Enzyme design. Structure first.
Site, PDB file in Angstrom:
ATOM      1  N   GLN A 110       0.475  -1.064  -0.894  1.00  0.00           N
ATOM      2  CA  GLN A 110      -0.242  -0.357   0.262  1.00  0.00           C
ATOM      3  C   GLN A 110       0.519   1.318  -0.246  1.00  0.00           C
ATOM      4  OE1 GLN A 110      -4.633   1.003   1.666  1.00  0.00           O
ATOM      5  NE2 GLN A 110      -2.594   0.998   3.120  1.00  0.00           N
ATOM      6  N   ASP A 153     -20.536  14.776  -7.831  1.00  0.00           N
ATOM      7  CA  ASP A 153     -18.936  14.359  -8.552  1.00  0.00           C
ATOM      8  C   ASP A 153     -20.068  13.365  -9.983  1.00  0.00           C
ATOM      9  OD1 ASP A 153     -16.662  14.285  -9.745  1.00  0.00           O
ATOM     10  OD2 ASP A 153     -15.808  14.947  -7.878  1.00  0.00           O
ATOM     11  N   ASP A 180      -9.825  -0.981  -4.311  1.00  0.00           N
ATOM     12  CA  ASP A 180      -9.295  -0.395  -3.592  1.00  0.00           C
ATOM     13  C   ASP A 180     -10.691   0.863  -2.576  1.00  0.00           C
ATOM     14  OD1 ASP A 180      -7.450   0.289  -1.306  1.00  0.00           O
ATOM     15  OD2 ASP A 180      -5.614   0.858  -3.057  1.00  0.00           O
ATOM     16  N   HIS A 229     -12.631  11.344 -12.859  1.00  0.00           N
ATOM     17  CA  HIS A 229     -12.724  12.629 -11.608  1.00  0.00           C
ATOM     18  C   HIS A 229     -12.991  11.909  -9.994  1.00  0.00           C
ATOM     19  CE1 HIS A 229     -13.623  16.423  -9.482  1.00  0.00           C
ATOM     20  NE2 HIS A 229     -12.506  16.576 -10.691  1.00  0.00           N
ATOM     21  N   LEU A 251      -9.570   2.345   0.903  1.00  0.00           N
ATOM     22  CA  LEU A 251      -9.308   1.637   1.856  1.00  0.00           C
ATOM     23  C   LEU A 251      -7.680   1.411   2.207  1.00  0.00           C
ATOM     24  CD1 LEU A 251     -12.173  -1.503   0.305  1.00  0.00           C
ATOM     25  CD2 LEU A 251     -12.232   0.521   2.413  1.00  0.00           C
ATOM     26  N   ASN A 256      -6.063  -1.277   2.982  1.00  0.00           N
ATOM     27  CA  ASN A 256      -5.946  -2.737   2.999  1.00  0.00           C
ATOM     28  C   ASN A 256      -3.931  -3.449   2.746  1.00  0.00           C
ATOM     29  OD1 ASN A 256      -5.545  -2.227   0.316  1.00  0.00           O
ATOM     30  ND2 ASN A 256      -7.141  -2.403   0.306  1.00  0.00           N
ATOM     31  N   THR A 295      -3.106  -2.897  -0.359  1.00  0.00           N
ATOM     32  CA  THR A 295      -2.596  -3.168  -1.992  1.00  0.00           C
ATOM     33  C   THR A 295      -3.250  -1.004  -2.089  1.00  0.00           C
ATOM     34  OG1 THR A 295      -2.821  -3.742  -4.380  1.00  0.00           O
ATOM     35  CG2 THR A 295      -4.754  -3.382  -2.627  1.00  0.00           C
ATOM     36  N   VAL A 318      -3.579   2.526  -2.558  1.00  0.00           N
ATOM     37  CA  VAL A 318      -2.779   3.863  -1.869  1.00  0.00           C
ATOM     38  C   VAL A 318      -4.072   4.037  -0.553  1.00  0.00           C
ATOM     39  CG1 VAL A 318      -2.912   5.439  -3.896  1.00  0.00           C
ATOM     40  CG2 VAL A 318      -4.770   5.086  -3.348  1.00  0.00           C
ATOM     41  N   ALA A 322     -18.064  27.066  -3.467  1.00  0.00           N
ATOM     42  CA  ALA A 322     -17.498  27.395  -2.105  1.00  0.00           C
ATOM     43  C   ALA A 322     -17.656  28.626  -1.977  1.00  0.00           C
ATOM     44  CB  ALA A 322     -16.000  27.087  -3.113  1.00  0.00           C
ATOM     45  N   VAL A 335     -20.359  27.066   3.080  1.00  0.00           N
ATOM     46  CA  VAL A 335     -19.133  25.801   2.500  1.00  0.00           C
ATOM     47  C   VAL A 335     -17.838  26.352   2.960  1.00  0.00           C
ATOM     48  CG1 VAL A 335     -18.887  24.719   0.327  1.00  0.00           C
ATOM     49  CG2 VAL A 335     -20.779  25.838   0.613  1.00  0.00           C
ATOM     50  N   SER A 368      -9.042  20.005  -6.631  1.00  0.00           N
ATOM     51  CA  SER A 368     -10.451  19.290  -6.728  1.00  0.00           C
ATOM     52  C   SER A 368     -10.055  18.037  -5.749  1.00  0.00           C
ATOM     53  CB  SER A 368     -10.751  18.334  -8.169  1.00  0.00           C
ATOM     54  OG  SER A 368     -11.993  19.089  -8.888  1.00  0.00           O
TER      55      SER A 368
HETATM   56 CA    CA Z   1      -5.216   0.661  -0.133  1.00  0.00          CA
END
Ligand code: CA
Ligand code: CA
Lengths: 274, 104, 274
Positions: free
Chosen positions: A2, A32, A41, A63, A74, A76, A78, A80, A168, A173, A220
């Site tokens: 990860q 989005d 993930d 996006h 997640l 986990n 693997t 990100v 924004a 917001v 973003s």
């Molecule tokens: Ca991951």
């Protein structure tokens, strides 16, 4: 293995996760271009589409999937990591395949999230013009207790020009600006009275459609860091008001310069979550 | 109209916008001129219509045509760009036309 | 009875010509609408046409002849005077009598030049987009030791907008902007990071079809001063590489201001061929 994008440690999201607070049981809605639930993930447990003939469980643009991964990739073994991995992710499609969408569609998505008791809304989108309908939407969301987070914009600076877009720019917001891996404001990050806080917005590595990853740039990418921090804070103090969470994030931000270009500064969820 | 707030990576933009006047002539020739646009001389006399179009480029001499005085027709993304403009990425290969309207 | 166009003295080509270097034995390919080979002040020793129906040694348009004149107008007692009077002039017609051509046609001229040994290639022409074929054609020509010069374009500026055209924008090509007799940038001169050097382009006098002369404007007029300057240098040092010649022109140029708008400045062939 990860990989941890710089954004996580920069805002100290790791510190809070190590405290054992990962946004568990906080519902976050990513309004989005949808999210690719099938991505290993990620884990989308619901949503709604307001894009004719298109499911909220898929993402034709990419996006939304990217933004979502910064919010909840997640934890986990693997890929990100997201700022708040254990969050209950909801994809609220309000933008089409070409990253565009009508205000009324976004208004519909905002209402949905509100009506489905969302805790946080992330709008990594914007328009140059205002709209009584949109202001009312995010205003009721906040009033209903929803932490509303939007990307400030990418109009850069120019003298004293206020280049903060809508929603924004609305005071209900949190307008989020961007900085790089060095806490330096990204040149494209919009400015003005309305700028509230800064977050990682340049070279953000995150999930990308069809089980992969990419590196994108923009407010973003910064907005989700904030919406995620909102989730962590809430998973630690379940009963804080949307207002209190908003104020603690802006209230503990590390100063970086004039509020005109930095708002209160770079968010520090560790300090925010104390 | 709302757009994804990501910063785009376009190369540049071309917006066929009519301009110039008799006493303040533009520099261009019928070849490099834009289709849909008309070019006139210092006396308002028609000379030709633009011969090229944004998508699909072609070669033109790079000299100003003395006979023409005026015409009549980076974070920016296709959604964020303006209609009436054509955006290209690096190695200027066409990408898309703007979708937004110019501010008023 | 011979006239000396302000451009020659301005880039100090007259000084270099007095030292005795005039571009002898240096081949220059003028890719354009052809050249009026029968002009008493021009000496076209070859070339080829890539335009169906038109021979290479004629010019129904006139632009190609003017461009050539600026480069190699013969040094006699008539008409004007070129930057490199003894250069071996080659007419490679890649634009019809209307001054129009297809990238396809241009690529053929570029290859012809490369294949046949041209030492310099001048292209007072361009398009706003650029293609893969064209790039490989100029990348190659330059790689084979050819000095590739092109007009930067007449789009003027527009805020921070890059308006340099192709093939001038590719970095295997020298993009030439234009200045007037006062060394001031012409308002039509294109701008952008790739702009490399400036040269006279406003009110440039020279040969024009039907054995006459005329005053034209455009970066189209500036490019042939550089190509001619390149030939002068090669006239003095035949052993320099296409790269070395290109660097002398840009590293010894007279500073005019910010590179975005003037590149390295006005070329000075006296300092460059030194
Ligand atoms: Ca991951
Ligand atoms: Ca002469």
């Amino acid at each position: 293995a990860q990989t941890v994008p710089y954004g996580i440690p920069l805002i100290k999201a790791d510190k809070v996760q190590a405290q054992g607070f990962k946004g568990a049981n906080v519902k976050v809605a990513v309004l989005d271009t949808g999210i690719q639930a099938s991505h290993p993930d990620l884990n989308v447990v619901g949503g709604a589409s307001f894009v004719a003939g298109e499911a909220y469980n898929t993402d034709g643009n990419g996006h939304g999937t990217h933004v979502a991964g910064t919010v909840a990739a997640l934890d986990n073994t693997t890929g990100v990591l997201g700022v708040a991995p254990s969050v209950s992710l909801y994809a609220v499609k309000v933008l089409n395949s070409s990253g565009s969408g009508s205000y009324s569609g976004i208004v519909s998505g905002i209402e949905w999230a509100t009506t489905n008791g969302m805790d946080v809304i992330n709008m990594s989108l914007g328009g140059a013009s205002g709209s009584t309908a949109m202001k009312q939407a995010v205003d009721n969301a906040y009033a209903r207790g929803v932490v509303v987070v939007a990307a400030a914009g990418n109009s850069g600076n120019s003298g004293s020009t206020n280049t903060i877009g809508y929603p924004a720019k609305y005071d209900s917001v949190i307008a989020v600006g961007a900085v790089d891996s060095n806490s330096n404001r990204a040149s494209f990050s919009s400015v003005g009275a309305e700028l509230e806080v800064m977050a990682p917005g340049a070279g953000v590595y995150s999930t990308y459609p069809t089980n992969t990853y990419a590196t994108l740039n923009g407010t973003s990418m910064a907005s989700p860091h904030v919406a995620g921090a909102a989730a962590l804070i809430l998973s630690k103090h379940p009963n804080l008001s949307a207002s209190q969470v908003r104020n603690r994030l802006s209230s503990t931000a590390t100063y970086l310069g004039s509020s005109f270009y930095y708002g209160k500064g770079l968010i520090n969820v560790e300090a925010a979550a104390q | 109209k709302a757009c994804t707030r990501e910063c785009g990576n376009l190369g540049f933009g071309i917006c066929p916008r009519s301009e110039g006047s008799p006493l303040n002539p533009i520099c261009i020739n019928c070849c490099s001129g834009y289709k849909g646009c008309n070019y006139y001389n210092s006396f308002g006399k028609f000379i030709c219509e633009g011969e090229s179009d944004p998508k699909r480029p072609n070669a033109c001499t790079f000299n100003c045509d003395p006979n023409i005085a005026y015409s009549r027709c980076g974070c920016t993304t296709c959604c964020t760009g303006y209609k009436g403009c054509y955006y290209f990425g690096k190695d200027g290969k066409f990408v898309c036309e703007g979708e937004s309207d110019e501010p008023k």
